[PDB]
């Protein structure tokens, strides 16, 4: 159908802390198979014209899935709430070799290797099976402990990433608080080559049933300080990618 920036900004008006949003515009949503019971929406902006998006538990509706368009972009605009926003700015500026795009930071000099990804609108519990199958085992990650952040991240950026994490935790627990408090979900998955820890949060909004946001640290089997026999190869800065047609 047709949401307008009036409804978007009306929903974002009740997100505490945000004071500098990026440019929004009207979209056009179009949207379901009875097999597997899935509604995959898509909608057309006018400056990017590419966004597609869940498994419902009730009879769909036009008004129904716009609650979810608001769930997604409400979850996205959380990255601009100031304390969280430049709480990420601190981890990016805190290292001269952390390159960003607004959604993931982490090489190479050619005209990026993920270290931490911002995943708005999703939760680890909703995708947990695909990781429990693929992971060697699972672990727990104490958020208040600085040493674990000294494990996944080097001691240079451990603190910044830490109170970035519990910055999101405080924001969801106090500015997106439900009447019945929601506990944050932190889940560790060990792989053969890396270590993936997920920090997922649910938040209360009046216009939406729920808001979801998770952040993923990946700490590879190799240290950043060592391994350098691999990163010093200038074949890195010689690779790009393109279509395979």
């Amino acid at each position: 159908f047709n949401i307008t920036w009036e409804e978007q900004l009306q929903a974002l008006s009740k997100l505490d802390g945000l004071h500098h949003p990026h440019k929004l515009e009207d979209i056009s949503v179009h949207w379901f198979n009875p097999v597997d019971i899935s509604v995959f929406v898509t909608c057309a902006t006018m400056s990017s014209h590419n966004t597609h998006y869940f498994k419902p538990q009730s009879s769909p509706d036009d008004a129904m899935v716009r609650e979810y368009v608001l769930s997604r972009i409400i979850a996205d605009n959380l990255k601009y709430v100031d304390n969280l926003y430049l709480a990420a700015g601190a981890v990016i500026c805190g290292n001269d070799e952390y390159i960003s795009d607004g959604n993931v930071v982490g090489h190479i000099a050619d005209g990026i290797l993920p270290v931490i990804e911002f995943m708005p609108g999703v939760h680890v519990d909703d995708i947990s099976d695909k990781l429990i199958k693929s992971s060697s085992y699972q672990g727990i990650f104490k958020t208040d402990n600085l040493e674990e952040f000294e494990f996944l991240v080097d001691k240079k950026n451990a603190n910044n990433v830490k109170e970035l994490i519990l910055a999101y935790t405080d924001y969801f627990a106090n500015k997106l608080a439900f009447k019945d408090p929601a506990e944050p979900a932190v889940e560790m998955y060990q792989f053969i080559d890396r270590t993936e820890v997920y920090f997922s949060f649910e938040g209360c909004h009046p216009d939406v049933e729920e808001v979801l946001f998770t952040i993923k640290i990946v700490r590879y089997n190799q240290p950043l300080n060592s391994m350098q026999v691999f990163l010093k190869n200038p074949l890195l800065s010689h690779i790009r990618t393109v279509v395979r047609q």
């Binding site: 009730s58 939760h123 909703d126 439900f178 929601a182 649910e202 049933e209 729920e210």
Partner: peptide
Amino acid sequence: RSRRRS
């Protein structure tokens, strides 16, 4: 409407 960590 029509939570994970209960």
